[PDB]
Coordinates of C-alpha atoms in Angstrom, one line a residue:
Chain V
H1 CA -16.3 30.2 -9.4
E2 CA -17.3 26.6 -9.5
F3 CA -13.9 25.0 -10.1
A4 CA -12.6 25.4 -7.2
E5 CA -15.0 24.2 -5.1
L6 CA -15.6 21.2 -7.0
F7 CA -12.2 19.9 -6.0
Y8 CA -11.4 21.8 -3.3
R9 CA -13.5 22.5 -0.8
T10 CA -12.8 26.0 1.5
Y11 CA -12.1 25.7 5.3
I12 CA -12.9 28.7 7.3
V13 CA -11.0 29.6 9.8
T14 CA -10.4 32.0 13.0
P15 CA -7.4 33.4 12.3
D16 CA -5.2 32.9 15.8
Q17 CA -4.7 29.2 14.5
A18 CA -1.1 28.7 13.1
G19 CA -3.6 25.5 11.0
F20 CA -5.3 22.3 11.8
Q21 CA -4.0 18.8 12.8
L22 CA -5.8 15.3 12.1
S23 CA -5.0 12.4 14.1
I24 CA -6.4 9.4 12.2
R25 CA -7.6 5.7 13.9
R26 CA -6.0 2.3 12.0
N27 CA -7.0 -0.7 13.6
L28 CA -4.4 -3.7 12.5
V29 CA -3.7 -6.7 12.4
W30 CA -0.1 -8.7 13.1
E31 CA 1.9 -11.4 13.8
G32 CA 3.0 -10.7 17.2
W33 CA 5.9 -10.3 18.8
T34 CA 9.0 -12.7 18.3
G35 CA 12.2 -11.5 17.9
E36 CA 14.8 -10.8 20.4
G37 CA 14.5 -7.6 20.0
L38 CA 10.5 -7.7 20.5
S39 CA 9.5 -9.4 17.1
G40 CA 12.9 -8.8 15.2
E41 CA 16.7 -8.1 15.8
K42 CA 16.6 -4.7 15.3
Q43 CA 13.2 -5.0 12.3
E44 CA 10.6 -4.3 13.1
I45 CA 7.6 -7.3 11.9
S46 CA 5.3 -5.3 9.0
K47 CA 1.9 -3.9 10.1
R48 CA -1.1 -4.6 7.8
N49 CA -4.1 -3.5 7.4
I50 CA -7.5 -4.7 7.8
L51 CA -8.7 -3.4 4.9
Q52 CA -5.7 -6.2 2.9
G53 CA -8.0 -8.9 3.6
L54 CA -11.1 -7.4 2.1
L55 CA -8.8 -7.6 -1.0
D56 CA -6.2 -10.4 -0.2
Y57 CA -6.2 -13.9 0.7
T58 CA -3.1 -14.4 1.7
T59 CA -2.7 -11.9 4.8
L60 CA -5.5 -14.2 7.1
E61 CA -6.3 -17.8 6.9
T62 CA -4.1 -19.0 9.9
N63 CA -3.0 -22.3 10.2
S64 CA -0.9 -23.3 13.3
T65 CA -2.9 -26.8 14.6
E66 CA -2.4 -29.0 11.6
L67 CA -0.7 -32.3 13.0
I68 CA 2.2 -33.1 10.1
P69 CA 4.9 -34.9 11.0
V70 CA 8.3 -33.5 11.0
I71 CA 11.8 -34.9 9.6
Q72 CA 14.1 -35.4 12.5
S73 CA 17.2 -36.7 10.0
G74 CA 18.9 -39.3 11.3
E75 CA 16.8 -40.0 14.3
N76 CA 12.9 -41.5 13.1
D77 CA 14.4 -42.2 9.2
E78 CA 12.1 -45.9 9.7
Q79 CA 8.9 -44.7 9.9
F80 CA 9.3 -42.4 6.3
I81 CA 9.8 -43.2 2.5
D82 CA 13.2 -43.4 1.4
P83 CA 13.8 -39.8 0.5
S84 CA 15.8 -40.9 -3.0
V85 CA 11.8 -41.9 -4.2
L86 CA 10.6 -38.5 -3.9
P87 CA 12.9 -35.7 -2.2
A88 CA 11.7 -34.2 1.4
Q89 CA 9.4 -31.1 0.4
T90 CA 9.6 -28.2 2.8
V91 CA 6.9 -26.3 4.3
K92 CA 5.5 -23.6 5.9
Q93 CA 3.4 -23.8 8.5
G94 CA 2.8 -20.5 10.7
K95 CA 6.4 -19.6 11.8
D96 CA 7.9 -22.7 11.9
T97 CA 9.8 -23.9 8.9
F98 CA 11.0 -28.1 8.9
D99 CA 10.6 -30.5 6.3
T100 CA 8.2 -33.7 5.8
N101 CA 7.6 -36.8 3.6
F102 CA 5.0 -39.0 3.4
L103 CA 4.7 -41.6 6.0
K104 CA 5.5 -45.5 5.1
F105 CA 2.5 -48.1 4.4
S106 CA 3.5 -51.1 7.5
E107 CA 2.4 -53.8 6.5
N108 CA 2.9 -56.2 9.7
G109 CA 6.2 -54.8 12.2
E110 CA 5.0 -52.2 14.7
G111 CA 2.9 -48.7 13.9
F112 CA 3.1 -45.0 14.8
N113 CA 1.9 -42.1 17.4
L114 CA 1.5 -39.0 16.1
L115 CA 2.1 -37.0 18.6
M116 CA 5.7 -37.6 18.9
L117 CA 6.6 -38.1 14.6
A118 CA 4.9 -34.7 14.7
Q119 CA 7.2 -32.4 16.8
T120 CA 7.6 -28.9 15.2
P121 CA 10.8 -26.3 16.8
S122 CA 7.7 -24.5 18.6
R123 CA 7.4 -27.7 20.0
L124 CA 10.0 -28.8 20.9
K125 CA 11.2 -25.2 22.4
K126 CA 8.7 -24.6 24.4
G127 CA 8.5 -27.6 27.5
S128 CA 7.5 -30.8 26.2
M129 CA 4.6 -32.3 24.3
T130 CA 1.7 -31.2 26.9
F131 CA -0.1 -33.7 29.6
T132 CA -4.1 -33.7 27.4
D133 CA -3.3 -34.0 24.0
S134 CA -6.2 -35.2 21.7
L135 CA -6.6 -35.8 18.2
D136 CA -10.1 -34.5 16.9
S137 CA -13.0 -36.3 15.7
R138 CA -12.2 -36.0 11.9
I139 CA -9.3 -37.6 10.5
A140 CA -8.9 -38.1 7.0
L141 CA -6.1 -39.3 4.1
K142 CA -5.3 -36.4 2.5
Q143 CA -2.3 -37.4 -0.5
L144 CA -2.4 -41.2 -1.8
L145 CA 1.0 -41.5 -3.3
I146 CA 1.5 -44.6 -5.9
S147 CA 4.0 -45.9 -8.8
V148 CA 3.3 -46.7 -12.0
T149 CA 7.1 -49.1 -13.0
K150 CA 7.2 -50.5 -17.0
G151 CA 10.5 -51.1 -18.1
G152 CA 12.5 -49.9 -14.9
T153 CA 11.3 -46.0 -15.0
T154 CA 9.1 -44.9 -12.2
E155 CA 6.0 -42.3 -12.6
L156 CA 4.6 -41.3 -9.0
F157 CA 1.0 -40.1 -8.4
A158 CA 0.1 -37.6 -6.3
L159 CA -2.9 -37.7 -6.1
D160 CA -6.1 -36.0 -3.9
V161 CA -7.8 -38.7 -1.7
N162 CA -9.4 -36.5 0.9
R163 CA -12.7 -34.9 -0.1
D164 CA -13.9 -38.8 -1.6
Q165 CA -17.0 -40.7 -0.5
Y166 CA -15.2 -42.9 1.6
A167 CA -12.4 -41.1 3.1
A168 CA -12.9 -40.4 6.8
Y169 CA -12.5 -42.8 10.4
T170 CA -15.4 -43.8 12.0
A171 CA -15.0 -45.3 14.9
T172 CA -16.2 -49.2 15.6
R173 CA -17.4 -51.0 18.3
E174 CA -14.7 -54.4 18.1
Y175 CA -12.1 -52.3 20.2
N176 CA -12.4 -49.9 22.8
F177 CA -14.8 -46.6 22.9
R178 CA -11.5 -44.3 21.2
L179 CA -10.4 -46.0 17.8
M180 CA -10.5 -44.8 15.3
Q181 CA -11.5 -46.9 11.7
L182 CA -10.7 -46.8 8.2
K183 CA -12.3 -48.4 6.0
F184 CA -11.0 -47.5 1.9
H185 CA -11.8 -50.7 -0.6
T186 CA -13.1 -48.6 -3.5
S187 CA -11.4 -47.8 -7.2
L188 CA -9.6 -44.2 -8.2
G189 CA -8.9 -43.1 -12.4
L190 CA -6.1 -41.6 -13.6
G191 CA -7.2 -39.7 -16.9
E192 CA -5.7 -38.1 -20.0
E193 CA -4.5 -35.1 -18.3
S194 CA -3.7 -35.9 -15.1
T195 CA -1.2 -33.9 -13.8
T196 CA 1.8 -35.8 -12.8
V197 CA 4.7 -35.1 -10.3
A198 CA 7.4 -34.0 -12.4
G199 CA 6.3 -33.3 -15.8
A200 CA 2.1 -32.5 -16.8
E201 CA 2.4 -36.3 -19.1
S202 CA 3.1 -39.7 -18.0
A203 CA 5.6 -40.9 -20.9
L204 CA 4.7 -44.7 -19.3
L205 CA 1.0 -44.9 -20.3
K206 CA 1.1 -41.7 -23.2
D207 CA -0.4 -45.0 -25.5
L208 CA -3.8 -45.2 -23.5
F209 CA -4.3 -41.6 -23.6
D210 CA -4.1 -41.3 -27.0
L211 CA -6.3 -42.9 -28.7
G212 CA -8.3 -41.3 -25.6
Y213 CA -8.6 -43.9 -22.6
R214 CA -8.1 -44.0 -18.6
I215 CA -7.4 -46.4 -16.3
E216 CA -9.5 -47.3 -13.4
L217 CA -7.6 -48.3 -9.9
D218 CA -8.5 -50.2 -7.1
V219 CA -7.5 -49.6 -4.0
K220 CA -8.4 -51.6 -0.7
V221 CA -6.3 -50.4 2.1
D222 CA -7.9 -50.1 5.7
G223 CA -6.0 -49.1 9.5
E224 CA -7.4 -47.8 12.6
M225 CA -5.6 -45.3 14.6
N226 CA -6.5 -43.9 18.7
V227 CA -7.8 -41.1 19.3
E228 CA -5.6 -40.2 22.5
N229 CA -2.7 -42.0 22.8
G230 CA -2.1 -41.8 18.4
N231 CA -0.9 -45.8 17.7
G232 CA -2.0 -46.4 14.8
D233 CA -1.7 -47.8 11.8
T234 CA -2.9 -48.1 7.8
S235 CA -2.6 -50.5 5.4
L236 CA -2.7 -51.5 2.5
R237 CA -3.8 -55.1 1.4
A238 CA -4.1 -55.3 -2.4
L239 CA -3.5 -52.7 -5.8
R240 CA -4.3 -53.9 -8.6
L241 CA -5.3 -52.6 -12.3
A242 CA -9.3 -53.0 -12.2
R243 CA -11.3 -51.7 -15.3
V244 CA -10.9 -49.7 -18.8
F245 CA -12.5 -46.6 -20.0
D246 CA -12.2 -45.1 -23.6
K247 CA -13.8 -41.1 -24.2
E248 CA -17.3 -42.6 -25.1
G249 CA -17.7 -44.3 -22.1
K250 CA -19.0 -48.4 -22.1
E251 CA -16.1 -51.0 -21.0
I252 CA -12.9 -51.7 -23.1
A253 CA -11.8 -55.5 -22.8
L254 CA -8.6 -56.0 -21.2
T255 CA -7.5 -58.7 -23.9
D256 CA -8.2 -56.3 -27.2
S257 CA -4.7 -55.9 -28.9
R258 CA -4.8 -52.1 -28.3
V259 CA -4.5 -52.1 -25.2
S260 CA -3.1 -55.5 -23.8
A261 CA -0.1 -54.2 -26.3
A262 CA 0.1 -51.4 -24.2
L263 CA 0.2 -52.4 -20.8
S264 CA 2.2 -55.4 -21.0
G265 CA 4.9 -55.1 -19.0
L266 CA 2.8 -52.6 -16.5
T267 CA 3.3 -52.8 -13.1
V268 CA 1.2 -50.6 -9.7
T269 CA 1.9 -50.6 -6.1
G270 CA 1.5 -48.0 -3.2
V271 CA 4.2 -46.1 -1.7
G272 CA 2.6 -43.6 1.1
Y273 CA -0.1 -42.3 2.7
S274 CA -0.7 -39.0 4.6
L275 CA -2.9 -37.7 7.0
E276 CA -4.9 -34.8 8.1
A277 CA -5.6 -34.2 11.6
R278 CA -5.2 -31.3 14.0
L279 CA -4.7 -31.1 18.0
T280 CA -7.5 -29.9 19.5
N281 CA -6.0 -29.0 22.8
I282 CA -8.8 -27.5 25.1
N283 CA -5.8 -25.4 27.4
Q284 CA -5.2 -24.0 24.8
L285 CA -1.6 -23.1 24.4
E286 CA -1.7 -20.5 20.5
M287 CA -0.8 -17.5 20.5
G288 CA -2.7 -16.9 17.1
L289 CA -2.8 -13.0 15.4
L290 CA -2.3 -10.2 17.4
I291 CA -4.6 -7.0 16.8
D292 CA -3.8 -3.6 18.6
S293 CA -3.7 -0.1 17.6
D294 CA -2.1 3.3 16.6
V295 CA -2.3 6.9 15.2
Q296 CA -0.8 8.9 12.5
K297 CA -1.1 12.8 13.0
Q298 CA 0.1 15.4 10.6
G299 CA 0.0 19.4 11.1
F300 CA -0.3 21.6 8.6
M301 CA 1.0 24.9 7.6
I302 CA -1.0 28.5 6.5
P303 CA 1.4 31.0 4.7
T304 CA 0.5 34.7 4.0
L305 CA 1.1 35.3 0.7
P306 CA 3.1 38.4 -0.9
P307 CA 0.6 41.1 -1.1
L308 CA -1.3 42.6 -3.8
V309 CA -1.0 46.7 -3.0
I310 CA -2.1 49.9 -4.3
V311 CA -0.5 53.2 -4.6
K312 CA -2.4 56.7 -5.5
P313 CA -0.9 60.2 -5.8
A314 CA -2.1 61.8 -2.9
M315 CA -4.7 63.8 -1.2
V316 CA -7.2 64.1 -4.2
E317 CA -9.8 62.0 -5.4
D318 CA -9.3 59.4 -8.5
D319 CA -11.2 57.1 -10.9
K320 CA -8.9 56.0 -13.5
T321 CA -5.7 56.2 -12.3
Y322 CA -7.4 55.6 -8.6
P323 CA -10.6 52.6 -9.6
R324 CA -12.9 51.7 -6.6
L325 CA -12.1 49.1 -4.3
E326 CA -13.5 46.4 -8.0
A327 CA -9.9 46.5 -9.0
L328 CA -8.5 45.6 -5.8
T329 CA -10.6 42.7 -5.4
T330 CA -10.7 41.5 -8.4
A331 CA -7.0 41.3 -8.9
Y332 CA -7.7 38.7 -5.9
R333 CA -9.6 37.2 -7.1
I334 CA -7.5 36.1 -10.0
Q335 CA -4.9 35.2 -8.1
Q336 CA -6.8 32.8 -6.2
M337 CA -9.6 31.2 -7.3
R338 CA -7.9 30.1 -11.0
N339 CA -4.0 30.4 -11.2
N340 CA -2.8 28.4 -7.7
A341 CA -5.7 26.5 -7.6
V342 CA -4.5 25.2 -11.3
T343 CA -0.7 25.1 -10.3
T344 CA -1.5 22.7 -7.6
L345 CA -3.5 20.4 -9.5
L346 CA -1.8 20.4 -12.5
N347 CA 1.6 19.2 -9.5
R348 CA -0.6 17.0 -8.0
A349 CA -0.9 14.7 -10.9
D350 CA 3.2 15.3 -12.0
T351 CA 3.9 14.2 -9.1
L352 CA 1.9 10.9 -9.0
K353 CA 2.9 9.1 -12.0
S354 CA 7.0 9.7 -10.9
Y355 CA 5.9 8.9 -7.7
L356 CA 3.6 6.4 -8.7
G357 CA 4.4 5.0 -11.9
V358 CA 1.2 4.2 -14.3
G359 CA -1.5 1.1 -13.2
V360 CA 0.1 -0.2 -10.9
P361 CA -2.0 -0.4 -7.1
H362 CA 0.5 -0.5 -4.1
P363 CA -0.4 -1.6 -0.9
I364 CA -2.1 0.9 2.2
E365 CA 0.0 2.5 3.9
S366 CA 3.0 3.1 0.8
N367 CA 4.7 5.9 0.4
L368 CA 5.7 8.6 2.7
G369 CA 5.7 11.5 0.0
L370 CA 3.1 12.4 -1.0
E371 CA 0.3 14.7 0.6
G372 CA -2.1 14.3 3.1
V373 CA -3.5 11.4 5.3
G374 CA -5.3 9.0 2.2
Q375 CA -2.7 6.7 2.0
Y376 CA -3.9 5.6 5.2
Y377 CA -7.1 4.4 4.5
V378 CA -6.9 3.3 0.4
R379 CA -4.6 2.4 -2.0
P380 CA -2.4 4.4 -4.3
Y381 CA -3.3 4.9 -8.0
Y382 CA -2.6 6.9 -10.5
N383 CA -2.5 6.3 -13.5
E384 CA -3.5 7.9 -18.0
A385 CA -4.5 6.7 -21.1
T386 CA -5.2 8.5 -24.9
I387 CA -7.1 8.4 -27.4
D388 CA -6.1 8.7 -31.2
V389 CA -9.8 10.0 -32.1
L390 CA -8.3 9.7 -35.8
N391 CA -7.4 6.2 -35.0
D392 CA -9.7 4.6 -32.8
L393 CA -13.0 6.2 -34.7
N394 CA -16.0 2.8 -36.2
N395 CA -19.3 5.5 -38.5
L396 CA -20.8 4.8 -41.1
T397 CA -22.6 7.7 -42.2
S398 CA -21.4 11.3 -42.3
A399 CA -24.4 12.2 -40.9
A400 CA -23.8 10.5 -38.1
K401 CA -20.2 12.1 -36.9
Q402 CA -20.7 13.3 -33.3
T403 CA -22.8 10.6 -31.9
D404 CA -20.0 7.9 -33.1
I405 CA -17.1 10.0 -31.0
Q406 CA -18.9 10.9 -28.3
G407 CA -20.3 6.8 -28.1
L408 CA -16.6 6.2 -28.3
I409 CA -14.9 8.9 -25.9
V410 CA -17.5 8.0 -23.1
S411 CA -16.6 4.4 -23.9
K412 CA -13.7 5.4 -22.8
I413 CA -13.8 7.5 -19.5
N414 CA -16.9 5.3 -18.0
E415 CA -14.8 2.1 -18.2
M416 CA -12.0 4.0 -17.4
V417 CA -13.7 4.9 -14.3
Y418 CA -14.8 1.5 -13.1
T419 CA -11.6 0.0 -14.0
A420 CA -10.0 3.0 -10.8
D421 CA -12.7 1.7 -9.0
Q422 CA -11.9 -2.2 -9.1
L423 CA -8.3 -1.9 -8.8
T424 CA -8.4 0.5 -6.0
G425 CA -11.6 -0.6 -4.0
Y426 CA -13.0 3.1 -3.1
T427 CA -16.9 1.6 -1.9
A428 CA -15.2 -0.8 0.4
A429 CA -13.1 1.7 1.8
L430 CA -16.2 4.7 1.7
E431 CA -18.0 1.8 3.3
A432 CA -15.8 1.3 5.8
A433 CA -16.0 5.4 6.5
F434 CA -19.4 6.1 7.1
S435 CA -22.3 3.0 7.9
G436 CA -25.6 5.8 6.8
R437 CA -25.2 6.1 3.4
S438 CA -24.3 4.0 0.3
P439 CA -21.4 4.2 -2.0
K440 CA -22.0 6.2 -5.2
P441 CA -18.4 7.8 -5.6
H442 CA -19.1 11.1 -7.5
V443 CA -16.4 11.5 -10.3
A444 CA -16.2 14.7 -11.2
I445 CA -14.6 16.1 -14.1
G446 CA -12.6 18.7 -15.5
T447 CA -12.0 20.5 -18.4
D448 CA -11.5 22.9 -20.4
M449 CA -13.8 25.3 -22.5
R450 CA -14.4 23.1 -25.4
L451 CA -14.5 19.6 -24.9
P452 CA -17.2 18.8 -22.7
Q453 CA -20.7 20.0 -26.6
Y454 CA -18.7 16.1 -27.2
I455 CA -19.2 15.0 -23.4
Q456 CA -22.7 15.6 -23.2
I457 CA -24.9 13.6 -24.9
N458 CA -27.7 11.8 -24.6
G459 CA -27.0 9.4 -27.7
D460 CA -26.0 6.9 -25.1
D461 CA -27.6 6.5 -21.1
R462 CA -24.4 5.9 -19.6
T463 CA -22.2 9.7 -19.6
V464 CA -19.6 8.5 -16.6
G465 CA -21.8 5.1 -15.9
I466 CA -25.0 3.4 -14.1
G467 CA -25.0 3.8 -10.3
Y468 CA -22.9 7.4 -11.3
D469 CA -23.7 11.0 -10.2
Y470 CA -21.5 13.2 -12.1
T471 CA -20.2 17.2 -12.8
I472 CA -19.1 18.7 -15.0
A473 CA -17.4 21.9 -14.8
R474 CA -15.0 24.2 -18.1
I475 CA -12.2 27.0 -17.3
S476 CA -10.8 29.5 -19.9
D477 CA -6.7 28.6 -19.1
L478 CA -4.8 27.9 -21.1
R479 CA -2.7 24.7 -19.7
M480 CA -6.2 22.9 -19.9
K481 CA -5.7 22.3 -23.4
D482 CA -7.2 19.3 -24.4
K483 CA -7.5 17.7 -21.2
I484 CA -9.6 15.4 -18.9
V485 CA -8.9 15.5 -15.1
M486 CA -11.0 13.0 -12.7
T487 CA -11.4 12.1 -9.3
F488 CA -14.0 10.9 -6.4
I489 CA -15.7 13.5 -4.4
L490 CA -17.8 13.5 -2.2
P491 CA -19.9 16.8 -2.7
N492 CA -22.3 16.1 1.0
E493 CA -19.5 16.8 3.0
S494 CA -17.4 19.8 4.3
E495 CA -15.1 18.9 6.6
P496 CA -11.4 17.3 5.8
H497 CA -11.3 13.8 5.8
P498 CA -8.4 10.9 5.2
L499 CA -11.1 10.3 1.3
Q500 CA -12.0 13.9 0.6
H501 CA -9.5 14.8 -1.9
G502 CA -8.0 18.1 -0.7
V503 CA -9.0 20.8 1.2
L504 CA -8.3 25.0 0.6
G505 CA -6.9 26.3 4.1
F506 CA -8.5 29.9 3.4
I507 CA -7.8 32.8 6.7
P508 CA -10.0 36.2 6.1
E509 CA -8.2 38.9 6.6
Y510 CA -8.4 42.9 6.3
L511 CA -7.2 45.7 4.1
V512 CA -4.8 48.4 6.1
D513 CA -4.7 52.4 4.8
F514 CA -2.8 55.0 5.4
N515 CA -0.5 57.1 4.9
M516 CA 3.1 56.8 3.9
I517 CA 5.8 59.2 3.6
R518 CA 8.8 57.2 2.1
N519 CA 11.1 57.8 0.4
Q520 CA 11.0 61.7 0.8
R521 CA 7.3 62.5 -0.3
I522 CA 4.1 61.4 0.3
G523 CA 1.3 59.5 -0.8
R524 CA -1.9 57.2 0.9
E525 CA -1.3 53.9 0.5
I526 CA -3.6 50.4 0.3
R527 CA -2.7 46.8 0.7
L528 CA -3.4 43.2 0.9
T529 CA -3.0 41.6 3.3
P530 CA -4.0 37.3 1.2
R531 CA -3.3 33.8 3.2
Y532 CA -4.6 31.2 1.8
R533 CA -3.2 26.8 0.9
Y534 CA -4.2 24.1 -1.2
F535 CA -3.6 20.9 0.5
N536 CA -4.0 17.5 -1.3
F537 CA -4.8 14.1 0.4
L538 CA -6.8 12.1 -2.1
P539 CA -3.7 9.6 -3.8
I540 CA -5.5 8.8 -6.5
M541 CA -6.3 10.9 -11.0
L542 CA -6.9 9.5 -13.9
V543 CA -5.7 11.6 -16.5
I544 CA -7.6 11.3 -20.4
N545 CA -5.5 13.2 -23.4
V546 CA -8.4 14.4 -26.6
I547 CA -5.6 14.6 -29.6
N548 CA -6.2 14.7 -33.2
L549 CA -9.7 15.8 -33.6
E550 CA -9.8 18.7 -35.6
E551 CA -8.4 16.7 -38.4
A552 CA -11.0 12.9 -37.4
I553 CA -14.0 15.6 -37.7
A554 CA -12.5 16.9 -41.0
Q555 CA -11.4 13.8 -42.3
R556 CA -12.8 9.8 -43.7
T557 CA -12.1 7.5 -40.5
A558 CA -14.1 4.3 -41.1
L559 CA -14.0 0.6 -41.7
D560 CA -11.3 -1.1 -40.0
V561 CA -11.8 -4.0 -42.3
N562 CA -9.3 -6.9 -41.5
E563 CA -9.5 -9.2 -44.6
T564 CA -9.6 -13.0 -43.5
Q565 CA -6.9 -15.2 -45.2
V566 CA -9.0 -16.6 -47.7
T567 CA -5.7 -16.0 -49.7
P568 CA -3.8 -17.8 -49.1
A569 CA -1.1 -16.7 -46.7
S570 CA -1.7 -19.4 -43.5
Chain K
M1 CA -14.6 26.3 -36.4
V2 CA -17.0 28.8 -34.0
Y3 CA -16.3 26.0 -30.9
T4 CA -12.6 26.8 -31.1
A5 CA -12.5 30.4 -32.9
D6 CA -14.6 30.8 -29.2
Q7 CA -12.5 29.1 -27.4
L8 CA -8.7 30.9 -28.8
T9 CA -10.0 34.3 -28.2
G10 CA -11.1 34.7 -25.3
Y11 CA -15.0 36.1 -26.7
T12 CA -17.7 35.5 -24.3
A13 CA -15.6 37.0 -21.1
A14 CA -15.0 39.9 -22.5
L15 CA -18.4 40.2 -23.8
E16 CA -19.4 39.3 -19.9
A17 CA -17.8 41.6 -19.3
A18 CA -18.7 44.9 -21.2
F19 CA -21.5 44.0 -20.5
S20 CA -23.0 43.2 -17.5
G21 CA -26.0 41.4 -16.9
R22 CA -26.8 40.6 -20.7
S23 CA -27.1 36.6 -22.3
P24 CA -23.6 35.4 -22.7
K25 CA -24.3 34.0 -26.1
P26 CA -22.6 35.2 -29.6
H27 CA -25.0 35.8 -32.1
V28 CA -22.8 34.5 -35.2
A29 CA -24.0 35.4 -38.5
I30 CA -23.4 34.0 -41.8
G31 CA -22.8 35.2 -45.3
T32 CA -22.4 33.5 -48.8
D33 CA -24.1 33.4 -52.0
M34 CA -26.9 32.3 -53.4
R35 CA -26.5 28.6 -53.6
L36 CA -25.2 26.8 -50.0
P37 CA -28.7 27.7 -47.5
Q38 CA -30.2 24.9 -49.9
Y39 CA -27.3 22.3 -48.0
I40 CA -26.7 24.6 -45.1
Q41 CA -30.2 24.3 -43.8
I42 CA -31.5 21.5 -42.1
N43 CA -34.2 19.2 -41.0
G44 CA -33.5 15.6 -39.8
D45 CA -30.0 15.8 -39.4
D46 CA -28.5 14.8 -36.1
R47 CA -26.8 18.3 -35.6
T48 CA -28.4 21.5 -37.0
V49 CA -26.1 24.8 -37.4
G50 CA -26.4 26.6 -34.0
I51 CA -25.6 24.0 -30.9
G52 CA -23.8 26.1 -28.8

């Protein structure tokens, strides 16, 4: 029968096998052995499948060389701003956990060297700072902090100054050959919507924003830094308010009553700065990220199902009490090809509903109670939707009911297929598994014998969507009332894969015939010994409910009209 | 109505089983009065009275 073949491709096995087993390869990237107990005291650091990085950006993009200052809490407090203005910020760098704060401006006194100032616990553990550590060709200001004060209240502006025109250290010819020089002589602005360190809007510059005014602040900052010993210092030279602009863009006088009223008593000044530097250490000391391999191998067992058997009176032949083997074989078929298949399909759907929830995508390698090996290779996902055709149809004339109903149902199913493809990334998995065939996920649609006439359509060019191949199967079984069963199945291939939906293990077997003298009588007997089993692999299934059909066709259902409240209601 | 009756009574399976080799197409007769067929017969409709 077509239906059994459609979802569970039959696999013939030679009789001498207890089953079949598969070994699946996984390629993994992971932070590496770290703990006192080989990456954890008793714990194992979580592995991640490489396909996660395709659908996420947190599993990757490591930094291990970011030279950022680290606080030693009472040993170098002279070179950091007072923590009474901005509390220290905890930062996660690799595995290191340590506190940071802005380096304060130095006007006259001694400068700083970056290497000593930046010693993370990874640096403290191992022998020392190494002999040949050199800074990059590129060093720039990352974040400049300025303070606006009015009436004794202060607001901090964590202004990103990176990726400006003039913010990158460049060498000069006035000293040695390694001094990188910085020249910051330009005027930054503050807007009506500029987020603050605290809150979102400053209450001291609110008046300018209300009329739609932006202020220009001129910044003059110089600094010299040496790329071999780190000794360098940066100096604020003058900070002031430069210009005022409104929404329209031409200049607004500073003496004008409105502006000069609000800016009376306003003072601006700098606080600190942060340096963006990385440590190019040829003779590199970095773990980076470790990768490895491992496999999960599983075995499948095939049982021997209870026998279908025939008994007939002895010594004669009949054709009614003993029909031909046709009754035997048809009993075989009605056992196998519909009943167990639909039962295992419904059981799979129910178990997926119970284990995975609705509409929630779980990461790869999740849940072990699921059948098959697909979840090692694709994310688990199962969802259902209900269509109230009585309440959701839009028509204009009773002469086109069927076109509208088919349009509704097919649009729903097509959008469902699209979003199911979206959340699971199936096409990427198929590309990873096969490099010789373009990913065209073939969706097999299961339904009973009534529904397809509303599903076969020429009113809409899409029936499952553009660039998707589909197949329609029908079964008369009563359990499939008003249901649509859909899954991604691979028609081309006929051997087990993790991304294959299911496999029907089948053991062909013979017939035994003899004279059974039992219970003090004699009679020729005929038996069957069947062996097979349905196996489930892919953890994706979508079930669509179609209800209230009869009244929808038999009743008027038209024109949800949303009158737009010009009768006073709001 | 024809589709629902077909689905509930399983007529097609019985017809195919009893008579082997012939098309499993049920043949439907509709008896009514002189006035209705002027509204049953279709020319220009999106649906005919013989689909399926």
